[PDB]
Amino acid sequence: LPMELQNLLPRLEATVTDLKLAHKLDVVKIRQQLQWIHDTIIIIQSTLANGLFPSDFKEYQEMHKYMNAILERKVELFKFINCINEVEPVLSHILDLLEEDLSATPKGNVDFDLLFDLIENCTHESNFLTPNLKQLKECIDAAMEFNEISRDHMDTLDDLINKNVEKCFEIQELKFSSPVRHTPNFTLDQLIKLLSSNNNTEPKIPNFSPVEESLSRKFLILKRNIPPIEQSLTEILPQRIEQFCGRNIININLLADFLQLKYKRIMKNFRFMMNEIKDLKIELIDKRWNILFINLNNELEYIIEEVRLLLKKINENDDLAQTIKDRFNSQLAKKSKIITKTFNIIYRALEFSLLDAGIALKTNELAKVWVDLRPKSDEILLHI
Amino acid sequence: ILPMELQNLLPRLEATVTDLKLAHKLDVVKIRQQLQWIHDTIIIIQSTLANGLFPSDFKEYQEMHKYMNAILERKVELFKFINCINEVEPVLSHILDLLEEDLSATPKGNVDFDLLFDLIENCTHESNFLTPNLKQLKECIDAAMEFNEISRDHMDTLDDLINKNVEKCFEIQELKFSSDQLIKLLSSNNKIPNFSPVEESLSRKFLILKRNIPPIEQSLTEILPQRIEQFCGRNIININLLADFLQLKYKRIMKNFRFMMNEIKDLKIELIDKRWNILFINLNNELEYIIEEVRLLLKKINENDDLAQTIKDRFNSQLAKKSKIITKTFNIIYRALEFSLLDAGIALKTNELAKVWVDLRPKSDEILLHIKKFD
């Protein structure tokens, strides 16, 4: 934006630098360059007097664009302030030499000529200095950090949180797209085998399929992704508080105003994702354990009935062949053994507390009948 | 010894490992070793902090200052150190995403379980060590950086500068205590000490001194922000003591400043006010005497009647010449009242003289005006 000023800046540091590291008073040369600096200072101030520099923007966040504008050519504005803040000490260097060369015997009218010029630079120095150092420099630093907290920190966390919500959804699409649509039939032997696998290894997803091995793994990465995000939503409050008050710039009111809304917006979105994952955990764990136990209770109740029917038949028809009576006994033996293996493994399984109150009771209703029937089974297989 | 030196054995190795971890494609058994190595190294690093404690409650101590300096010496390296360990969680997430992309049901899954347990094993040690250590350590480095800036580069500088002003202030007085007319030059002027044309130089040395003050005085009201910021802003309870130390430093420097201010204010009276005062004391004294000179001259003319033309003409020319000086003097003195250089006190003496001269000047003037009539 300040094309005119860019052409001047290089000579400015060159002259200031020359003055900065000169020990000889060339009264003629020093006068020339000091006068130049004075005129150029005024020029820079007039161009920077709200032409293309900070003014009250309390009206709208259009200032965001002006901050972005600063950062584009921030390399240059930093260069300007560094030179101008060097001025006061540069002039002080010049002043010592004047005092050192200011012998009583000579008139030293040169000292007057230059001190008037020096103090002439200082008045404009002090006028231009206060806005650039106090406001412009701070505005670059504030806008630099504000872009960090908004773009690098807040925007990134929203991206992360959204991707966690999609992974949340991506998981459900795998569950629905599987051999087990819902309520999967199993064999009591296999139910034992799989239930017993889980006994041996917060809960984990049961293995209905090679797909469940996948869902389990995918869900584990999802569950581990959240804490860093949740850390950063308790840890961003400090960085948000610091800039919100510490900066004490004119437009800070508007910035903190905006950031508070962005944080509130993303915190809502965060709580949604947390809830979605909570709801998913119940589906992929509690529900799965529920249906498995419905499955158990179905087959358990049936094979318990089968056993009761066999007992009835043996007592009613003890007059039949030993081929028949031996097959009847071997069946009752085989069936009884599994029923107790089932109730044992059930009763050694932690997940029973997850179970819906209804289905847990069905298992318990079956349990009660089996404590009555097993002795009646056992006394018969005693004689065999 | 240095605890940093123990960690400095293998910091490059930790960075190297994560560098290749960032950009690894389809590495299985190799990755298992790499990850495991990092885990063990991290625990070793956690133990080094325990042996020589970078984060510790030294708040009770005033040896904090020593501890700052120690950190800043090797701070260059601690940034390299901090940067890699903070990168761990996101680096492993990339690995996990690569692992998740493998899929392949049971076969890939079995290896994946060995890996995730290893990865989450890295993270417990990363997160435990990483968060507590580096949070406080990074703050402490930044706090130490700023604290030395505000104490050495800002506060110590201003003390040096203030003292040099007091030295110059003193240096001037030694020259004042160790060493013509300005006749109408007074009238030309009509606050410049043009009293000693030779030592008009000393005033210019005072002028630069008077000009040096405000930047210093600016910096003593603009340091309060930087002092207030660092005082409360720092999260560490350790700041409380640093705040106390800076408050004591500031009050010490502020006393020295007010002394230097007073010293220069006292000096200004001695160079500018006193010299102006004596000039006008001197003029009033001359004025009184030349007024007297006139009265005697008037008396001589009147008392001894007949005198030589040579004598009567000399007497008259003196009376004329003396009267003109008296008014030139009154004129100058009363114009010093406008610039307000003349003390209100010595003003009264001039006024007392003025009154006697308004009674004599007619007696002077009648003599001269008869001579003026003659043509």
Q: Choosing among B208, B209, B231, B235, which should be mutated to test the A contact, i.e. which has the most A CBs within 10 A?
A: B208
CB–CB of B290/B326 below 8 Å?
yes
Distance CA(B328)–CA(B338), nearest Å, equals 16
CB–CB of B71/B54 below 8 Å?
yes
Which residue type occupies B355? K
The DSSP line for B236-272 is STTHHHHHHHHHHHHHHHHHHHHHHHHHHHHHHIIII
Paired tokens of A340: 């107790």
* Structure-determination approach: X-ray
Distance CA(B184)–CA(B328), nearest Å, equals 9
8-state DSSP, B151: I
- Torsions phi, psi of A46, nearest 5? -60, -45
Q: Give the gap in angstroms from C-alpha A24 to the nearest C-alpha of chain B.
A: 19
Paired tokens of A190: 């296999």
Distance CA(A64)–CA(A61), nearest Å, equals 5
Q: Of A257, A158, A255, A175, which Cα lies nearest the Cα of A212? A: A175
CB–CB of B179/B106 below 8 Å?
no
Residues of A in contact with B112 (CB under 8 A): 217
Helix (H, G, I), strand (E, B) or coil at B305: coil
Q: Do A104 and B204 touch (CB under 8 A)?
A: no
Q: Do B201 and A119 touch (CB under 8 A)?
A: no
Question: Measured in whole angstroms, how far is the alpha carbon of residue A265 from the centre of its chain?
Answer: 14
Long-range contacts of B322-329 (CB under 8 A, 24+ apart): B322/B290, B322/B293, B322/B294, B322/B297, B323/B294, B323/B361, B323/B364, B323/B365, B323/B368, B325/B290, B326/B287, B326/B290, B326/B291, B326/B294, B326/B357, B326/B361, B328/B184, B328/B187, B329/B283, B329/B286, B329/B287, B329/B290
Q: How far apart are the first and last CA of chain B?
A: 111
- Which residue is closest to A228 within chain B, CA to CA? B89
CA dihedral B105, B108, B109, B110 (to 10 degrees): 130
8-state DSSP, B10: S
A299, containing H or E segment? helix A288-316
8-state DSSP, A58: T
Angle (CA) B269-B271-B276 rounded to 5° is 80
Which residue type occupies A258? F
Cβ–Cβ pairs < 8 A, chains A and B: 55
Indicate the burial class of B23 (C-beta count within 10 angstroms; 0-12, 13-18, 19 or more). Answer: exposed
CB–CB of A316/A309 below 8 Å?
no
Mark out the alpha helices in B74-195 (DSSP H runs): 75-102, 105-148, 157-176, 185-189
CA A18 vs CA A34, A91, A98, A126, A232: distances in Å:
11, 12, 17, 21, 50
Paired tokens of A339: 């029923």
- Which residue is closest to A95 within chain B, CA to CA? B208
Angle (CA) B328-B334-B338 rounded to 5° is 130
Question: Measured in whole angstroms, how far is the alpha carbon of residue B359 from the centre of its chain?
Answer: 59
Q: Who among A111, A119, A210 is closest to B204 (CB)? A: A111
- Within 8 A by CB and 6+ apart from B228, the residues are none
Distance CA(B210)–CA(B213), nearest Å, equals 6
Query: Residue A271's CB: how many other CB atoms inside 10 A?
Result: 12
Distance CA(A360)–CA(B211), nearest Å, equals 91
Helix axes A109-131, B200-233, angle to 10 degrees: 20
Angle (CA) B148-B153-B159 rounded to 5° is 115
Question: Measured in whole angstroms, how far is the alpha carbon of residue B90 from the centre of its chain?
Answer: 47
Distance CA(A27)–CA(A31), nearest Å, equals 6
- Within 8 A by CB and 6+ apart from B162, the residues are B216, B253, B256, B257, B260
- Torsions phi, psi of A319, nearest 5? -90, -5
CB–CB of A308/A373 below 8 Å?
yes
Indicate the burial class of A154 (C-beta count within 10 angstroms; 0-12, 13-18, 19 or more). Answer: buried
Long-range contacts of B364-368 (CB under 8 A, 24+ apart): B364/B294, B364/B298, B364/B319, B364/B323, B365/B323, B367/B298, B367/B301, B367/B316, B367/B319, B368/B316, B368/B319, B368/B320, B368/B323
Residues of B in contact with A95 (CB under 8 A): 208, 211
Q: Scanning the structure block, which residue is given the tokens 């809960």? A: A203
8-state DSSP, A55: -
Q: Of A194, A185, A188, which Cα lies nearest the Cα of A334? A: A188
Q: What is the CATH number of domain A178-383?
A: 1.20.58
Q: Of A51, A115, A140, A121, which Cα lies nearest the Cα of A83? A: A121
Distance CA(B101)–CA(A274), nearest Å, equals 24
- Within 8 A by CB and 6+ apart from A335, the residues are A303, A306, A307, A310
B26 in the Ramachandran plot: left (φ > 0), alpha (ψ -120 to 50) or beta?
left
CB–CB of B209/B168 below 8 Å?
yes
CB–CB of A205/A219 below 8 Å?
yes
Q: Of B183, B138, B124, which Cα lies nearest the Cα of B328? A: B183
Helix (H, G, I), strand (E, B) or coil at B108: helix
Q: How far apart are the first and last CA of chain A?
A: 105
Q: What is the CA radius of gyration of chain B?
A: 43
Distance CA(A203)–CA(B119), nearest Å, equals 19
CB–CB of B326/B294 below 8 Å?
yes
A→B interface, C-beta within 8 Å: 88, 92, 95, 98-99, 102-105, 108, 111-112, 115, 119, 122, 210, 213-214, 217-218, 220-221, 224-225, 228, 231, 238, 242, 246
CB–CB of B34/B21 below 8 Å?
yes
- Resolution, in Å, please? 3.3
The DSSP line for A105-160 is SS--HHHHHHHHHHHHHHHHHHHHHHHIIIIIIHHHHHHHHHHIIIIIIIIHHHHH
- Torsions phi, psi of A164, nearest 5? -65, -40
Percentage helix, strand, coil, to 5, in chain A?
Answer: 80, 0, 20
Angle (CA) A318-A322-A325 rounded to 5° is 50
Question: Measured in whole angstroms, how far is the alpha carbon of residue B189 from the centre of its chain?
Answer: 35
Distance CA(A270)–CA(A160), nearest Å, equals 10
CB–CB of A374/A307 below 8 Å?
no
Largest CA distance in chain A: 151
